[PDB]
Symmetry: C6
């Protein structure tokens, strides 16, 4: 990664074993549940493209997903080159493949990230990777929201947990609550809780619905 | 987070893997037991709004609770905007890190004078966590009754653990909760506690039923 | 905590996850055995009142003990206010509730701890907490020294271990050896070892008693 | 390794116990799966030849592979000496850290201009690791065939894992491997994949057989 | 402990959680095996008396041993006071950290010239630990005899482990312990060891009975 | 150990608990397999003689090996004194027992290691220790290369692994491949693989032999 030392200047540091092992274990434990994306963003903080490739390449399984991620990176790369056609001791401009760390050296990557003004090739590449991870998370979501239905003896809290977890994966995003998803939550509740939720009438908050079906 | 380096100057650092893993494991182990709030406050020390969103977003389960937390944040956001018509002034959505950049967040937190958007957002999150802790509290204090063979210490432990979760708070001891602790004790210990008379300390009650 | 940076000046640092997890695990493993107090003193080194409250508040069980600790803190607080009745840019004097971190901000706590001269509100509060932990350790000591008696086939070393562990908890303190506890150690030994210990005569050291009952 | 301290100057540090243990555990867990190469490149960042030899020498098993690695290093060493007749110039055996001191290695790596003997040696080691990864690849891509009840995603996972090991490389997707992926699919999924027509993306194939 | 920061100046730091946990775990795992003394010396490096008391006080079991240790410390304290009638001079109880403040301890350890009260107290503690190690040594060297089917290496391991604990020390090899090692060997290996003749090295004895 | 601080000057640091625990665990796991030597060299980097004695003394078992190591150290010590017979504020010259940290203080050891010019007593002692560890590794090698023979159903890769692991321990060294060890590898292969290896003819590489017996 690129960080400020105690002298306050930008400098390259080797990716830490702790950071790398945390990412490898995140992928092993969480697969492509939607929470893997925020973990990726946190652990890749300050990353060079070289660091980002290290993080993706150290993954041993999920090679179908890693090939889907490469298609997305190549698409984002081509789009960058399309919208960016092309002084002594200054950097050549970065191509798509330079941002993805394929055709760029570490020295060039750090050069761009510490140039005046900076070209944050690390942050641009991280954005492309997250677009690919979002796509994988939606593809791998195992159950449609249409089939998330409260079991006849499933507590309402456990049903609401499954419901909002499914919406988060299908949208690769937690901005999923609104008047219409409230209606779907009620539609897919079991007969007992459904009858109770309808009697609350319109505009019932999640707190009030969860309280009303708790007994 | 924003911290003082060894040169003593305020600067942004990446959230540490250790800190992130500690929070994720706290939530996995402790669910929404009341002690998760002090753990949240400790592990979010010096946090930017961006760091606070990282900590909440890395939680994979409890998505019902995460939506309750968002409603509370949005309420606190609207209230901030209502009471507040080099840096542009922050809106509610800037404090919650939705419409603000890292650069803006660090700008505000290191401005003269500082606008601690990190500490303001942490306050809103704790309000939401308190609400979740009370919602998830499984047992009313009314149902905490000493078993016929339960040591008094084990009953007092269950009693004050229940008050803490029901009130998302440990300022639960007073003359009336003392009365309820006595009321719900088993006949043997209840008879002993009454004979102490009024105003008995917790030490004296726990000594007398030991 | 408050520490000296490499420039040698006093500054606040966030409590470390390692420190917090060590305290939480100390309490989970050691309950209120007397060794929890020295662990508390070591892990709370440089602590602000805010840090000390973090350490106590992160404990999930033992809420009977945590309420006993609060009674003791409130007593120490009232006593401070009793014995301390009440320039531009200097600190207001601390009340009991400011030392316990209830009515004081972090900024005020660090202010006091780095004032000329310093008011060590962290060290004053730690003292109050240790008085509360001492009281809990004595209350929770499960066996009176009167009932620590060598089993008929218990090795003498194991009996002496139980004896001095009990004295440490009942006094919340390891200054427990003297001519009279030597006499009690002999009184409560099994008939075989008791007969051997009496024949040593007066003034026998612990080494000599432990050697004499080893066979 | 040779790194910049907080004063921003290049200096030698002892290899860290954490780094060494991470590499030893990577080799124990992952054997010569292709992902061991990127782990090697990450954990050897800033390495001197001395550090690289430490990392290879601390491996206790796989001594057949360690001798294959040495043959490759000796080949790269001879090739360097062939193409290269304050610091004396480095020989192949100086880059591999056999005939060079730490002082010489750090000298070269911090010279104006620098001779990155660490990065040159790491390149030779990766060439050797690639060779081992292909030798140890247990299954030909020709034998990766979708089971009659195997989900397509699990078959695609096995297919691209096999190409990666057979080629010690993840640049394995192209029009002809797409054709082989279809050829080796089960009858049901094969019939679906053919009806998509030519040029179907991996996303579209994986969606269609889901 | 008192250490040099990166500015190269002597300053007090809080004992680290890692160091404390390492010592507590050393005592839990190794009891009073002789190797606990070198572990104590390593983990107490730069310790103030306050730090040394923290390390001893955090031990929860072995309270018989902890009282033996205190008798030895009090003996060394009295002896110091006997031979020693800006900083006031330290008494025995000041070196053991009973009657001295942290400020005084750091004062002495950073005085010109320094009075290393930390190193003096560590010496007294090691004297006490040596005494405990010998008391707890479970087997006399006289009872270490090679089994009829015990490999010689396993017998030599038990022999030198026993001498180390009996003497709280690894300077145990000499012409007379060589003679005892031979005397207590099994008949087969004893006959072989005698035929080597006098002055045989440990290498040659271990080779001959292999 | 002795290291450069961020001011770039040589200074003593306490041995780290992590470093010590890594060495103790290396010895517990790897015994005296030949890879323990490179682990010893890595973990003892920058060590004073005092640090090196800490590392050896913290080992609880293997006391036969620790006495063999002491014989070798004493031999290297005597040899140093033989080949080194003997200004204000400069260091006395080191004896063998000063390099081994027996008759030298930490202050003297750091003095020598930071003298102009330096006497690297740490690196000299580490060399003596490695000579002792090499000797132990050869002594403890459990099987002669003469008895490493491919099992009738042992895969060739597993046989070659055992073969080169044995040569490494018997030479305490991995410079073990050459035309004659190639001949011994063939001699000791099972009849099936032996017949295949002979038909390759002379000069066959290890890659070609391992490929030819893989089926």
């Amino acid at each position: 990664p690129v960080v400020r030392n105690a002298q306050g200047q930008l400098t390259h540091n080797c990716i830490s074993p702790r950071t790398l092992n945390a990412w490898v274990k995140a992928v092993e434990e969480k697969a492509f549940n939607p929470e893997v994306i925020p973990m990726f963003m946190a652990l890749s903080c300050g990353a060079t493209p070289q660091d980002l490739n290290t993080m993706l390449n150290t993954i041993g399984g999920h090679q179908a997903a890693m090939q889907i991620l490469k298609e997305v990176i190549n698409d984002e790369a081509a789009e960058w080159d399309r919208t960016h056609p092309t002084a002594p001791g200054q950097m050549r401009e970065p191509r798509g493949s330079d941002i993805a760390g394929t055709t760029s050296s570490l020295e060039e990557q750090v050069g761009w990230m510490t140039a005046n003004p900076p070209i944050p090739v690390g942050d641009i590449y991280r954005r492309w990777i997250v677009l690919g991870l979002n796509k994988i998370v939606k593809m791998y979501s195992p159950v449609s929201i249409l089939d998330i239905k409260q079991g006849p003896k499933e507590p309402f809290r456990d049903y609401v947990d499954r419901f909002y977890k499914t919406l988060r994966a299908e949208q690769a995003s937690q901005d999923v609550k609104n008047a219409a998803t409230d209606t779907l939550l009620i539609q897919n509740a079991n007969p007992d809780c459904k009858n109770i939720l309808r009697a609350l009438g319109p505009g019932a908050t999640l707190e009030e619905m969860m309280t009303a079906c708790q007994g």
